[PDB]
Amino acid sequence: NAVKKNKRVLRGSVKEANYFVEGEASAATIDAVLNDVDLVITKIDADEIAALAGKLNGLTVADEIKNVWKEEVSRLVGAGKLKEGDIKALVA
């Protein structure tokens, strides 16, 4: 369904961004970034997932993708849904 497709957009975006590193991303880097993505996803409902997917859809620039994630994390921290140190690599 829609939320299934939209979660794929979210998870795919960080692979498109090469996990925000240069060259070949290590297992540790991949784990860290995708763990952060998964954690964000557990905090947001289908409407929020759709909105975020719409912002990520079609982006190709790694830094721009990262900025969209940083924006979402800041929204969630302000909403009291995440705490400062919960998300690491994704917003570095």
Side-chain angles (χ1 to χ4, degrees), residues 48-62:
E48 291 170 301
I49 289 166
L52 182 61
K55 294 176 177 68
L56 291 165
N57 206 305
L59 294 188
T60 56
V61 177

Side-chain angles (χ1 to χ4, degrees), residues 2-3 6-7 9-10 39-56 68-69 71-82:
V3 75
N6 290 337
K7 286 184 290 183
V9 173
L10 304 195
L39 179 59
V40 170
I41 288 171
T42 69
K43 303 303 189 181
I44 53 174
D45 68 25
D47 291 321
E48 291 170 301
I49 289 166
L52 182 61
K55 294 176 177 68
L56 291 165
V68 169
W69 283 102
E71 165 74 8
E72 179 72 341
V73 170
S74 291
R75 184 185 69 84
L76 291 169
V77 167
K81 296 179 175 180
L82 288 169

